DNA sequence: GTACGTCCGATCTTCGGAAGAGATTCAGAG
DNA sequence: CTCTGAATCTCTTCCGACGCGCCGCGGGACGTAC
RNA sequence: UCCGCGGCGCG
């Protein structure tokens, strides 16, 4: 929903979904580069928490 | 030091956009605390793909993996406290909390021979 | 009996226990424990009674 | 002074009331 | 001494009226170009 | 522009 002015009144669902899909994108972009196992494990845990 | 181990790179995370700032802060902490033997070098991966058009021009700096820096420190308590003391840095990324987890030597070789080819198509 | 239940027997043991209790999950150090304890109830900056 | 891309470190104080799950314990017997 | 074992203590969750009327603030920070 | 938060008030 847009509010009075040049800004937008966003809902929490948009922010949560954006965070989740960004985390998934980073997950995808790290796997193909043979990233260190510790870092991929940590970011997998952080995606799980998200 | 007291032994002859490989002070291999260790994973430390920072806040995005401050990786160079965190590296400089660590370097100046090492300089002022006068404890330089326990530490080696701070290295952050980066890559350079140059494009002559498309908005951003003549340079494009990215990271192999963001929000993580590598430290040449060694297992002890003084260095652990020193790294914890720097701002904008949370706990280590390893196994158990008190003692972090190192990186495999072969995979360290993989990361370093990936790093040595960054100087491809120079000039 | 309050002292009898207590397993600590030295100032170092008490400092280690309080350091581990205040912030769990970190290697305890006697200097670190002393610094943490002195900064909790005996420092003008973070503690000040009116 | 004004668009714009990326992001997400100062560590919480003051209620019963019940219901339920899990850790503890000592009670007692073989 | 040792094994069950039923009872007890401790830790975690969900719950706490229902219709209005009025007013004010709301993604903020933060560096990075331009 | 229809949403959220907070505050005050009436039954």
UniProtKB/Swiss-Prot annotation, chain A:
Q: Please state what the protein is called.
A: DNA-directed RNA polymerase subunit beta'
User: Could you say which residues of the full protein are shown?
Assistant: 253 to 302 of 1407
What does the record give as the function of this protein? DNA-dependent RNA polymerase catalyzes the transcription of DNA into RNA using the four ribonucleoside triphosphates as substrates.
The text of the family note is:
Belongs to the RNA polymerase beta' chain family.
How does this chain assemble? The RNAP catalytic core consists of 2 alpha, 1 beta, 1 beta' and 1 omega subunit. When a sigma factor is associated with the core the holoenzyme is formed, which can initiate transcription.
List the coiled-coil residues.
Answer: none
Q: What is the lineage of its organism?
A: Bacteria, Pseudomonadati, Pseudomonadota, Gammaproteobacteria, Enterobacterales
From Swiss-Prot, chain B:
Question: Which terms under GO biological process does the entry name?
Answer: DNA-templated transcription termination; regulation of DNA-templated transcription elongation; ribosome biogenesis; transcription antitermination; transcription elongation-coupled chromatin remodeling
Task: Please list every transmembrane segment annotated in the UniProt record, as residue ranges.
Answer: none
Keyword list, A-Z: Ribosome biogenesis, Transcription, Transcription antitermination, Transcription regulation, Transcription termination
Q: Which residues form a coiled coil?
A: none
Its domain of life reads: Bacteria
Query: A Gene Ontology CC term for this entry?
Result: cytosol
Q: What does this protein do?
A: Part of the processive rRNA transcription and antitermination complex (rrnTAC). The complex forms an RNA-chaperone ring around the RNA exit tunnel of RNA polymerase (RNAP). It supports rapid transcription and antitermination of rRNA operons, cotranscriptional rRNA folding, and annealing of distal rRNA regions to allow correct ribosome biogenesis. Participates in transcription elongation, termination and antitermination. In the absence of Rho, increases the rate of transcription elongation by the RNAP, probably by partially suppressing pausing.
Question: What does the entry's free-text domain comment contain?
Answer: The N-terminal domain interacts with RNAP and the C-terminal domain binds either to Rho or to RpsJ (NusE). These domains are separated by a flexible linker.
Family from the record? Belongs to the NusG family.
Q: How does it assemble?
A: Monomer. Interacts with the transcription termination factor Rho and with RNAP. One NusG monomer forms a stable complex with a Rho hexamer. Binds directly, but weakly, to the core enzyme of RNAP. Also interacts with RpsJ (NusE). The rRNA transcription and antitermination complex (rrnTAC) consists of RNAP, NusA, NusB, NusE (rpsJ), NusG, SubB, ribosomal protein S4, DNA and precursor rRNA; S4 is more flexible than other subunits.
- Return the protein name: Transcription termination/antitermination protein NusG
What organism does the record attribute this protein to? Escherichia coli (strain K12)
From Swiss-Prot, chain C:
Oligomeric form and interacting partners: The RNAP catalytic core consists of 2 alpha, 1 beta, 1 beta' and 1 omega subunit. When a sigma factor is associated with the core the holoenzyme is formed, which can initiate transcription.
Q: Which family does it belong to?
A: Belongs to the RNA polymerase beta chain family.
The role this protein plays is: DNA-dependent RNA polymerase catalyzes the transcription of DNA into RNA using the four ribonucleoside triphosphates as substrates.
User: This chain belongs to which protein, by name?
Assistant: DNA-directed RNA polymerase subunit beta
Q: Which residues of the full protein are shown?
A: 349 to 398 of 1342
